[PDB]
Write a protein that binds this ligand. Structure first.
Ligand SMILES: O=C(O)CNC(=O)C(=O)O
Ligand SMILES: [Mg+2]
Ligand code: NI
Ligand SMILES: [Zn+2]
Length: 331
C-alpha cells in the first residue's frame, strides 16, 4: 500500500504532465496521495494563472463575514456576522490596517502559535464564497473554471443525466480568517489555488480516520451533536492541533503559499487559517473513485447546512433513501 502513514505529499508536475488534469489526479492517487486527505501541487515554472493581479480591486465582496468566536482557545465555534459590501481594494486596506494586520513574527511556526493562542480574541472579516474566477481564459492547464463538471462525471460513470452546474468560488482572506473542520459537500474533492498574497495553513485528517475526528467533535461540542447527526456540515467548529494530539487524532499540517495548488480528497476533513491578506480560488470536482464516497456521505437534515442547487441531484441519485428527509432540511 502506498503512503501507509498518510503523509501529505507534494508534487512537482512537468509542463507535459500538467496537460491532463484527470490523468495527474489518478497518478497522485497511484502514489498514495489521497491517504493523507490533502496534497500540494507546485505548478511547472512555465505556467501562470494569469498575467498580473494588478486589476482586481474592483471585485465586490457583497457579503463580507465577520468570524466571531466562542469557546476556549483550542476548542471553539465561529459564527458569521454579515457586514456591509465592500470592494477587494477596500477589503485589502482593512486587512492591512493596524486592527487586522498580521503581527510581527519569526516564521510560520511562530505565527501558528500566535494563531492558536489568540484567534478567539479577534473577529477577522472573510470575503468567502464569491462566485467567480481569476484564471485567464487563455490558461489551458489547471484552469479551475474549465474543469470537467461533477454532473458530467456522474453521467459518464453512472449513465444518469442530471441538472446542475459546477463553478468556482473566490476567497479573500486576512490574518486569522478561519475555515472550520469539514469535508466537502457530498464528500467531493476540492482543489484550491492561492492566487496571491499571504499563506494559508491547512490541517487534515486522513479519510480512513475521519470517524475518529467525528467522535471527538461529538464529545467536544455535545449540544451541537444532539442537534444534528452531521453538525460538522455546518462548518463552524474548530479544534486545535494541541487538542487533536491530546486526544490521539491522526492529522497532518502544511502551509500553502501563493502560486500553489492544494487538493483535498473525498472524506478528508480539513481546517485552517490565513496568514494575512490573500486571495484563493476553489472548486469541487469528482473522479470515478469519488462515487462510492458520495453514496455514503453524511448529511445535515436539521436545516443549518443549507447548500447549493446542484447538491439536490447528487442526493436524489446517490442517496434516494435520504432524499425526502434531506430535502425537508433544505426547505
Ligand atoms: O480556503 C478556504 O477558506 C476554504 N477552502 C476549502 O475548504 C477548500 O478549498 O476545500
Ligand atoms: Mg477589478
Ligand atoms: Ni474545503
Ligand atoms: Zn445540521
Amino acid at each position: 500500500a502506498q503512503n501507509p502513514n498518510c503523509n501529505i505529499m507534494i508534487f512537482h508536475p512537468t509542463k507535459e504532465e500538467f496537460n491532463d488534469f484527470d490523468k495527474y489526479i489518478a497518478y497522485m492517487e497511484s502514489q498514495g496521495a489521497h491517504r493523507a486527505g490533502l496534497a500540494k501541487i507546485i505548478p511547472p515554472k512555465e505556467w501562470k494563472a494569469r498575467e498580473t493581479y494588478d486589476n482586481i480591486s474592483e471585485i465586490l465582496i457583497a457579503t463580507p463575514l465577520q468570524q466571531v468566536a466562542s469557546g476556549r482557545a483550542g476548542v471553539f465555534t465561529q459564527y458569521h456576522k454579515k457586514k456591509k459590501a465592500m470592494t477587494v481594494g477596500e477589503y485589502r486596506h482593512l486587512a492591512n490596517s493596524k486592527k487586522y494586520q498580521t503581527p510581527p513574527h519569526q516564521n510560520f511556526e511562530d505565527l501558528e502559535r500566535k494563531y492558536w493562542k489568540n484567534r478567539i480574541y479577534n473577529s477577522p472579516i472573510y470575503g468567502a464564497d464569491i462566485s467567480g474566477s481569476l484564471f485567464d481564459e487563455n490558461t489551458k492547464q489547471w484552469n479551475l473554471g474549465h474543469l470537467g463538471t461533477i454532473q458530467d462525471l456522474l453521467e459518464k460513470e453512472c449513465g444518469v443525466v442530471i441538472e446542475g452546474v459546477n463553478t468556482p468560488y473566490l476567497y479573500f482572506g486576512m490574518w486569522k480568517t478561519t475555515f472550520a473542520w469539514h469535508t466537502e459537500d457530498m464528500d467531493l474533492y476540492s482543489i484550491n489555488y492561492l492566487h496571491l498574497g499571504e499563506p494559508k495553513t491547512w490541517y487534515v485528517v486522513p479519510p480512513e480516520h475521519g470517524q475518529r475526528l467525528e467522535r471527538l467533535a461529538r464529545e467536544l461540542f455535545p449540544g451541537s451533536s444532539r442537534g444534528c447527526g452531521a453538525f460538522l456540515r455546518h462548518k463552524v467548529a474548530l479544534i486545535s492541533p494541541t487538542v487533536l494530539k491530546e486526544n490521539g487524532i491522526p492529522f497532518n499540517r502544511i502551509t500553502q503559499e501563493a502560486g500553489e495548488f492544494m487538493v483535498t480528497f473525498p472524506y478528508g476533513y480539513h481546517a485552517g487559517f490565513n496568514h494575512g491578506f490573500n486571495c484563493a480560488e476553489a472548486i469541487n470536482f469528482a473522479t470515478p473513485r469519488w462515487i462510492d464516497y458520495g453514496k455514503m456521505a453524511s448529511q445535515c437534515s436539521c436545516g443549518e447546512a443549507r447548500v447549493t442547487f446542484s447538491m439536490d441531484a447528487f442526493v436524489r441519485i446517490l442517496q434516494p433513501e435520504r432524499y425526502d428527509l434531506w430535502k425537508r432540511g433544505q426547505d
